[PDB]
């Protein structure tokens, strides 16, 4: 605290250790609400220096459901109106209905999450990634563990449904070397009978494709 | 409601015996007394008729999927979470669209995947294109060199 109009930033306290009472509690790390304590016992400046927060979880962390990212039900000590009674109360976070679209499982999915999760989802690139880079005891949800499983399947199904495109392109490539000439349409049966990729399915499928050449023009 | 015998026999010989040439037992003929149930009774005994799809593969294409480098992991269906309990208490919960809700998902086995925006799909199609590029070395032989350059960096030291 200094009184000049324009106090340009500087390395150290320009005018000695900052004077005032509230500067006395900031010089020791406490927050400026220590100025309103009537007793500042060695436990008090421990209690209010936030060494370890007096703040807990509504249900057991092992049995928690709604995704509370990094929150507790912190109690806020209020001082009442005209006659200053001091009372305290437990303030919760705001849980929104998280109705997201996790494109891993190509469908909306709902998990109720605190506002802070609805931000850290978007900071993580998607809803699913926020489920996936968090880990067990960190993402202490239960719904988050039911939707991580579907996320872990419906990912390892994409990877599986990918290698299809590498076992299919292998066939498609290696069979083209036997669809080389249109000499015999009795032979196009035999090459198809070779890879057991029947004609009646393929013929019209290519037909629908040349029609699709006409469906897309 | 096809209740009175005169009405049930007037429908059952015509639609389930006549049109479909199905024949219902006695104990099912009891509950087979509505347009809703007539439809289902058929739609079970005709669904139990389609020859079970025969997974038959040729040989010439078979040796392709064997020698092909990239193979499927293919065990994930079990990782899926189980919801086993009394069929009612499990089903009473889905009194409404409690289906996609609260970390559940009606997992229908999907055979093809949308490729647009699908992170986990582009997350590997590049990792694949990073595998075809690394694979290019071993084809030409710059891998063996760049690997034989380590041991000659790690020998004289």
């Amino acid at each position: 605290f200094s009184t000049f109009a324009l106090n340009p930033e500087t390395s150290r306290a320009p005018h000695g250790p900052p004077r005032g009472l509230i500067n006395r509690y900031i010089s020791m790390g406490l927050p400026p609400w220590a100025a309103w304590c009537n007793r500042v016992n060695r436990h008090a400046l421990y209690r209010m220096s936030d060494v370890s927060p007096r703040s807990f979880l509504p249900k057991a962390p092992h049995e928690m459901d709604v995704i509370w990212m990094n929150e507790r039900v912190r109690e806020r000590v209020r001082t009442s109106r005209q006659v200053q009674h001091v009372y305290r109360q437990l303030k919760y976070p705001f849980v929104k209905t998280g109705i997201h679209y996790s494109d891993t499982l190509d469908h909306w999915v709902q998990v109720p999450m605190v506002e802070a999760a609805m931000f850290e989802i978007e900071k993580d690139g998607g809803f699913d990634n926020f489920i996936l880079k968090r880990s067990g005891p960190e993402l202490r949800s239960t719904y988050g563990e039911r939707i991580r499983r579907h996320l872990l399947v419906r990912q390892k199904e994409t990877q599986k449904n990918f290698v299809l495109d590498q076992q299919a392109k292998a066939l498609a490539e290696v069979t083209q070397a036997e669809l080389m000439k249109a000499t015999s349409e009795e032979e196009l049966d035999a090459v198809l009978a070779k890879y057991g990729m029947d004609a009646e399915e393929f013929k019209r499928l290519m037909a629908k494709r040349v029609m699709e050449q006409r469906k897309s023009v | 409601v096809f209740e009175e015998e005169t009405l049930r026999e007037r429908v059952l010989d015509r639609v389930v015996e006549g049109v479909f040439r199905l024949v219902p037992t006695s104990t099912d003929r009891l509950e087979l007394k509505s347009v809703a149930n007539i439809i289902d009774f058929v739609l079970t005994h005709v669904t139990v008729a389609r020859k079970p799809l025969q997974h038959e593969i040729p040989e010439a294409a078979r040796t392709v999927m064997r020698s092909h480098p990239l193979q499927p992991q293919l065990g994930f269906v079990h990782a899926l979470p189980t919801d086993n309990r009394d069929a009612v208490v499990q089903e009473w919960e889905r009194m409404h669209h409690l289906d996609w809700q609260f970390g559940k998902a009606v997992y229908e086995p999907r055979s093809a995947e949308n490729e647009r925006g699908n992170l986990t799909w582009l997350r590997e199609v590049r990792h694949h294109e990073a595998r075809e590029a690394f694979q290019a070395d071993v084809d030409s032989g710059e891998a063996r060199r760049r690997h034989m350059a380590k041991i000659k960096a790690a020998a004289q030291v």
């Binding site: 299919a168 498609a172 069979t175 083209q176 669809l179 990729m197 290519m206 | 093809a112």
Partner: peptide
């Protein structure tokens, strides 16, 4: 059936 659809 996927190798079918490419062609």
């Amino acid at each position: 059936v996927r190798a079918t659809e490419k062609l």
